[PDB]
Amino acid sequence: DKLTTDIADTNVFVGGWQLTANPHEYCKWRRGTKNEDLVLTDGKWSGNVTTTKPIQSKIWRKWQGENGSITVPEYLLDKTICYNDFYGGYEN
Amino acid sequence: TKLKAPAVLAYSRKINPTNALMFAVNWSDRDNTTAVMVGTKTVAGTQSVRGNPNDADKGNIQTVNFANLPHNKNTLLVKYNVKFVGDVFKAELGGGEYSNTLQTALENTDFGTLAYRYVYNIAAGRTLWRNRVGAESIETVITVNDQTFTFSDLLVNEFDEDVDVAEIADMVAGVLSGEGFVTLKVEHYMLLGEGSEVFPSQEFVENSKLSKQLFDLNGQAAMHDQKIGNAIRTIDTWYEDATTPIAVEPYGSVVRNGVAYRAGNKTDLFTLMDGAVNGKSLTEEDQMFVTANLIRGGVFGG
Amino acid sequence: TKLKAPAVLAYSRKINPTNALMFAVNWSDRDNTTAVMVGTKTVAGTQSVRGNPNDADKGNIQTVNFANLPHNKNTLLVKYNVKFVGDVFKAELGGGEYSNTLQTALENTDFGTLAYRYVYNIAAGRTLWRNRVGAESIETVITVNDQTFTFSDLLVNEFDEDVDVAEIADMVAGVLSGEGFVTLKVEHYMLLGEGSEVFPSQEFVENSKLSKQLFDLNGQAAMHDQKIGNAIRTIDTWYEDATTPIAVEPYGSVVRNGVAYRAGNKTDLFTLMDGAVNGKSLTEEDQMFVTANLIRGGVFGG
């Protein structure tokens, strides 16, 4: 019902609309959420991150990180993503 | 049978020390005492934590509290009063069946060894904690019911036989076995050297600007009474694989080493206490341990 | 295996120096010690701050300290007692599942060299940073267990052989390898010249505050105890690309140069102690560095 043999506008047989910008606007490749990137720079986080401590009950392996970046949706940017060494992002 | 415990059962502190005030004296002139003051100094460190090495750069730079002897006197004096109190087997706020069966259970305990280890921890200067580090000579003056006892450097981890420690422990055991009380005014003289940094009790703080804050009373350097009292009951040499005396605790628990020395091997206070009430025979060292926890105090409820 | 380090693991400071009190003497009149007073001159100037442009019109009457020699004495005398203490392997907050493995991994430490470099930093003048600069004559007197030692010409950068430092290093290594303490009363006499300006240590001021605080005990110019402790442990010539002795840090980090020499290249203390308690073969120099850190002390937890 989405990959049908029609042309529609966001469909697959698209004809007539290739001339327009419609199949590249309404059918977006890797359509994701806003996605801002909170970046860890040498152990110091950029935005509203606040490093936390995991439960240390059954962790087998936990690797630490100092550089890199985490991809946070704009919805969860409102609150602190609370990055942690064991499990990355959550709501707390 | 099987008297379990009162859930409310608690015992009070039978060894009550005062806050150990610190003064600066000379080794020859011990009467001219001057208040060692807790000042604050600022400090530039190197930010050396175990984890991330990439913040080893830039300063650590924070303020802490310090207490040094002034550079005209070379001896640290520590003043406190330790009050041993009797009625040790009565529960202050616990029940009246379990408490009296525990009283009859520990009525034949060896109070002499208990009192000797307490008076030895007082007289060997174990109430001094890091202030003994680099001391030429530790002279302990214990005045008890108008009787002055002077002690030189005694070996602390072993409770070797001394006749003056046994002399004070005679009235301390007479107090602890029955009713009444006794007071020990204890003055420590350690030749720390002119200007040596002393170590008063540190404080627990959360939002303070000081990274380390020392305990003070009107600015004078002082030790916590709970720290001194913890060093009174560092007599436990009766746990499993005993090497050094640890503090008397219901679980033999030392916070610093992070391992409880009497938990998990059925040598804690509560199992022996329930056994002593329920009528199985206790050995002498664990009887002394249970009595030491009773005179330490604590809610043994649960 | 995989003996993971305790989070509470810390070691006490084992080289405890006092504050370096500073006096004015002559070169041939060494007994007449007059205390160097920190003078303080006022400077009139308006405030210029980033956060308050409205307050720049009037204010900031600042009064900056200074310390010179008096115009009748040409020699600056620096007195401090360095206290070396033993059992550097005892953790004070750590425990003994890791610290006992460290004891049995650093028992082969040549304390002789460690102590040599400590007493050489004591004697050669590493503890006299900006006031040994430009002095035509340097002298160090060390008094230790009623023994006097005289040092005149020791270049501070390399640890060359002199039997005088070695003599003291013996008893210092015997303390540090075993149990006990030793105290070196160190008096430095440097002939700078008539009325030459001297250099006390600096208290941390804010970005604003005043220009510079010099370190005062009871009005007299002095230098910080931790700053002398930085001088004594400045023995680290065993990191990769070692040009000059740096202060033994857990990360080999100097703040004033903006670089860390042992951080991030597997020669930091923490990887070496985990290698020691997991038992891989250490060389003599990095094991000596680890023992020097344990002498320095500090919390190593994570």
Method of determination is cryo-EM
- The subunits that touch chain B, with at least 3 C-beta pairs less than 8 Å apart, are A, C
Instruction: For C262, list phi and psi in degrees, rounded to 5.
Output: -120, 5
Cα C264 to Cα A43: distance, rounded to the nearest angstrom: 14
How far B133 CA lies from chain C's nearest CA (Å)? 7
Residue C189: HSE in the Cβ half-sphere, 13 Å Cα cutoff: 19
CA angle B12, B15, B17 (to 5 degrees): 115
- Chains B, C: CB contacts within 8 A come to 107
Strand partners, B214: B202
| Cβ–Cβ < 8 Å for C37, C221 | yes
Q: Which long-range contacts (CB under 8 A, 24 or more apart) does A4-10 make?
A: none
- Chains A, B: CB contacts within 8 A come to 10
Which DSSP symbol is given to A74?
Answer: G
Q: What is the residue-wise DSSP string for C238-291?
A: -STT--S-B---SS-EETTTTEESSTTTT-SHHHHHHHHHTTPPP-HHHHHHHH
| Cβ–Cβ < 8 Å for B87, B177 | no
**What is the three-class DSSP state of C163?**
helix
**What is the three-class DSSP state of C236?**
strand
Residues of A contacting chain B (CB within 8 angstroms)? 42-43, 64, 66
Strand partners, B256: none
| Cβ–Cβ < 8 Å for B198, B131 | yes
Residues written for chain C: 302
Instruction: For C202, list phi and psi in degrees, rounded to 5.
Output: -110, 130
The reply to whether C83 touches chain B by the CB within 8 Å rule is: yes
Element (H, E) at B79: strand B75-85
Block residue for tokens 């550079």: B71
> Following CA atoms C17, C18, C24, C27 in sequence, which dihedral angle do they give, to the nearest 10 degrees?
-30
Instruction: Provide the strand spans (E) within chain C.
Output: 10-11, 15-17, 20-25, 34-35, 39-44, 61-66, 75-85, 137-143, 148-151, 181-191, 202-203, 213-214, 216-217, 220-223, 253-254, 259-260, 298-299
**What is the three-class DSSP state of C289?**
helix
How far B62 CA lies from chain A's nearest CA (Å)? 20
Cα B211 to Cα B64: distance, rounded to the nearest angstrom: 5
Distances from the Cα of C138 to the Cαs of B187, C9, C34, C41, in angstroms?
43, 41, 19, 30
Residue B267: name the closest of B240, B298, B294 by CA.
B240
Cα C176 to Cα A12: distance, rounded to the nearest angstrom: 81
| Cβ–Cβ < 8 Å for C294, C269 | no
- The structure was resolved to a resolution in Å of 2.9
Could you tell me the two tokens for A7? 């042309």
Which DSSP symbol is given to C55?
Answer: G
Distances from the Cα of B106 to the Cαs of B265, B285, B297, B299, C181, in angstroms?
22, 11, 15, 18, 43
Cα B66 to Cα B73: distance, rounded to the nearest angstrom: 17
Please list every residue in chain A whose beta carbon sits closer than 8 Å to the beta carbon of residue B51: 64
Please list every residue in chain B whose beta carbon sits closer than 8 Å to the beta carbon of residue A42: 52, 54-55
The reply to whether C129 touches chain B by the CB within 8 Å rule is: no
Cα C172 to Cα C160: distance, rounded to the nearest angstrom: 18
Distances from the Cα of C282 to the Cαs of B57, C103, C233, C235, in angstroms?
26, 14, 21, 19
Cα B117 to Cα B288: distance, rounded to the nearest angstrom: 11
Cα B235 to Cα B122: distance, rounded to the nearest angstrom: 11
Q: What is the residue-wise DSSP string for B124-150?
A: TTTT-SSTTTT-S-EEEEEEESS-EEE
Could you tell me the two tokens for B207? 């939002």
Is B196–C18 a contact, with Cβ atoms under 8 angstroms apart?
A: yes
Could you tell me the two tokens for B111? 């109070």
Cα C208 to Cα C260: distance, rounded to the nearest angstrom: 28
| Cβ–Cβ < 8 Å for C188, C128 | yes
Cα C100 to Cα C103: distance, rounded to the nearest angstrom: 5
Breaks (C-N over 2.5 A) in chain C follow: none
Cα C35 to Cα C302: distance, rounded to the nearest angstrom: 46
**What is the three-class DSSP state of C68?**
strand
Element (H, E) at B260: strand B259-260
Cα B293 to Cα B242: distance, rounded to the nearest angstrom: 18
Please report, as a single letter, which amino acid is at residue C35: A
Tell me the torsion sign for CA atoms C252, C7, B127, B164: negative
